[PDB]
Amino acid sequence: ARVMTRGEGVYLWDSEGNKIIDGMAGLWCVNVGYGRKDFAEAARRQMEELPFYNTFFKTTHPAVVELSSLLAEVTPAGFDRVFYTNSGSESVDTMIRMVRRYWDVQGKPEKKTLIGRWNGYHGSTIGGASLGGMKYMHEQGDLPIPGMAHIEQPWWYKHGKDMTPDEFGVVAARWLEEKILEIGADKVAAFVGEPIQGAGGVIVPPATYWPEIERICRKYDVLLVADEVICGFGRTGEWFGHQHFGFQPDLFTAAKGLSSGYLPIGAVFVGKRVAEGLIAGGDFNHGFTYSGHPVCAAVAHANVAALRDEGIVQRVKDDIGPYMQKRWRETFSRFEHVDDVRGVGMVQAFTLVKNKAKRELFPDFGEIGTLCRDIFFRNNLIMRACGDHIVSAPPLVMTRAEVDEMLAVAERCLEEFEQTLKARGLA
Amino acid sequence: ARVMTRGEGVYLWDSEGNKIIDGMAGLWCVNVGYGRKDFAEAARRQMEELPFYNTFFKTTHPAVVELSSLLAEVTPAGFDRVFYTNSGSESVDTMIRMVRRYWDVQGKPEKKTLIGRWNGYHGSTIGGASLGGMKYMHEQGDLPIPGMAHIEQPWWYKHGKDMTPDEFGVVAARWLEEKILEIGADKVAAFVGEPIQGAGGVIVPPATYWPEIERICRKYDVLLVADEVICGFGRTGEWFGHQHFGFQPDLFTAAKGLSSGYLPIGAVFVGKRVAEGLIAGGDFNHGFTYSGHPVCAAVAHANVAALRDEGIVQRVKDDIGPYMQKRWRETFSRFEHVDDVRGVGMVQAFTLVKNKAKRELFPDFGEIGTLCRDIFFRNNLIMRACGDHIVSAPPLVMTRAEVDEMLAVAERCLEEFEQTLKARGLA
Ligand SMILES: Cc1ncc(COP(=O)(O)O)c(CNc2cccc(C(=O)O)c2)c1O
Ligand SMILES: Cc1ncc(COP(=O)(O)O)c(CNc2cccc(C(=O)O)c2)c1O
């Protein structure tokens, strides 16, 4: 069929010469777009010159030292300890072990349960798939493992009932309290959440949600962990998604955001309280000192430098983010089977619905999303279909003109979509 | 104070100008040695030119297609389905989930327990740490998780009593049968082992061990899994360690040996029975090659091509392997506190012992190993201490002269070690 032949900026090309507008590469964290020659050079040099680690060497690799130094400058107050891995899935798994070790060290070994959310996603390790709330992943491996619990997701469109979003955000956060009390606070180690659920369909919680979650976590002496694997490194306009929603996690996980997707890498960023805890047990100290594939760290360093020095993150907050959000809602809000148009910064979405009046979803959630996605692709546009949610997360460097080009095509596709719907009486 | 400044061939350099022999090949993984400029070029080109999706519409990324095509040529017959990951740890975790999903699809809901070995090592995830048998690891994330069991390792020097190695291989393999009947066969999904235990100290099992493990696995309808993360890609003289020992696994896992450590990557090679069983449910399907990274696949491709086309693996079997093994046994067999001199291909080891007569180990296993290791480093030689086992696995490209050079230095270090023992009355 059609193979990929080239990537540059926000586009990729196929073997037939088609230019494909990549409206989703940020879900794989390609935040600065394709074709960065300087990143390629950063990798080339490190691979030619240096070893890939070995030991005894009282030192941390110079590529890693530099990356760590730079990250301290761009992360929020209190994150000055970073543990490197090879992926977001590994970062999640390491985080689970850290959270449990922290409580062990505090002399509370029974505090082992982590609480996630249905439709949350935290990667594909046994630990991560257990903490995530995708039912199809739980079946593959008799998951979740012990010390994993789940609460319903803050999806107002489905569960918001007769409530305003804001009233719902309180109710949905209180589900965490209910679960903690059910399990017992002294068996609960942490609550873990993506600031905006990514793979679950860009579920943007109400403004009252995260503050209520945080309040509840502190009330019960439970750690708060953000999974920033999608939302970090400028996706919401802030450097990290938790900054946008105004909560303060005790740890947070990131992945290819570090490298804009150019090479595999992940990290766990550990706040002061937990860091002091772990080091006191002498734990994770070899990881903190020797973690990080130096080639990937070299690319990650060039990337984070670029995001800062080129003003890419600031440009999402001030310029392209507001432009995108306005243009997104302008384009999609009018369609008959489009509802819950949403987004922050450079992540945005809507849901294909049976009936906007009744807030009624299509049956066999996903079938209609697939149809819309298929139309997009026939028209040389990629966006992600998550059930009947259509989601977009383009490179952060996307211009105002590229935004319009993308939305012009998407608009044409929705017009076709609305017609195809009626034409088979699914409307 | 010193830092790494260069790697080339079998050598490393530090900031002081010191030339160091890398007898440990990074982390047993740098099989082609350092300084491959063609590898760096392969990464540069992919990073400059292409997107990073593993799949595009009906096709796979060209770099991945290429790697899989080449892998099919060098893998044992029947292993065409490969699932890519970012590390050996992720490969192990994916294997565990695959093993369990397979029995689910087969309608055997009880059949979920994986059996590993004490002193076995399968990575650092919750899943891999649980399947591994490192007692210090059994309480970082609350471990082992359920459906994990362990048998004793086939370590003749310690457990062999008054048996020949061949008699002991049968006894040590039958511990698996004893364990299966203790648990109940209906509950046991797989046995997993490194053909030779790596991090555990290059524990080479008797020739009788693997054939007997395999008979037992087939007798109870238990899957047989090889962890080739250290033994893979030519380390034993064969492409994979299971080929050397003459067993036929249903799946096997591989890590960065695939790329000689130049970039992070791993794989699960899935045999026909399990692949078909997973297809028969539609499980680990839509998103198979889709966990790894295509830049890493391009490097892995150049590496596997180099191992085949430059005759590196064949040279281990026919030339440098026999030489290393012969010369290793000449060099070390004579020392008063060195015993169990062993190895195959380009992995080899010996154990530091209190008394060769009684076969008595030093107390506080590890203390003496560290002492000997520090001597090596002071002498610009990297060899690994696992407890009181000393281990070596240099790049496979090491010349006969490089072999003697390494052994010349090692011999001098053992002379010094032997003096140090008496000069402390620890002889
Ligand atoms: C929130 C979150 N956490 C952890 C992971 C695991 O990261 P790695 O993939 O680096 O192991 C993820 C996965 N991140 C991810 C990557 C690509 C696509 C999509 C999508 O659903 O479109 C999501 C994720 O979305
Ligand atoms: C047998 C085995 N299985 C899985 C893993 C995990 O692979 P990754 O590390 O690629 O995730 C390993 C780890 N392999 C490994 C790596 C680095 C050092 C050492 C050492 O003990 O010197 C061993 C291993 O030795």
Author numbering:
A (entry chain A), B (entry chain B): 33 to 459
Show me the paper's own sentences about this structure:
The crystal structures and inhibitor complexes of two industrially important ω-aminotransferase enzymes from Pseudomonas aeruginosa and Chromobacterium violaceum have been determined in order to understand the differences in their substrate specificity. The two enzymes share 30% sequence identity and use the same amino acceptor, pyruvate; however, the Pseudomonas enzyme shows activity towards the amino donor β-alanine, whilst the Chromobacterium enzyme does not. Both enzymes show activity towards S-α-methylbenzylamine (MBA), with the Chromobacterium enzyme having a broader substrate range. It appears that the different rigidity of the protein scaffold contributes to the substrate specificity observed for the two ω-­aminotransferases.
We also present the crystal structure of C. violaceum Am:PyAT in complex with the inhibitor gabaculine. In comparison, the crystal structure of the C. violaceum gabaculine complex shows significant structural rearrangements from the structures of both the apo and holo forms of the enzyme. The C. violaceum Am:PyAT–mCPP complex was refined with partial occupancies of 0.7 and 0.6 in subunits A and B, respectively. The loop CV Ala57–Cys61 in chain A of the C. violaceum Am:PyAT–mCPP complex was built in two alternative conformations. The major conformation of this loop in chain A (occupancy of 0.7) folds differently, with the positions of CV Leu59 and CV Trp60 inverted at the bottom of the substrate pocket. The mCPP aromatic ring is rotated by approximately 15° between the two subunits of the C. violaceum Am:PyAT–mCPP complex. The carboxyl group of gabaculine forms a salt bridge with the side chain of CV Arg416 in the C. violaceum enzyme structure. The aromatic ring of mCPP is positioned in a hydrophobic pocket formed by residues CV Trp60, CV Tyr153, CV Ala231, CV Ile262, CV Leu59 and CV His318 from the adjacent subunit. The mCPP complex with the phosphate group bound in the same place is almost as open as the apoenzyme structure. In the inhibitor-bound structure the enzyme is conformationally relaxed in a state between the apoenzyme and holoenzyme structures.
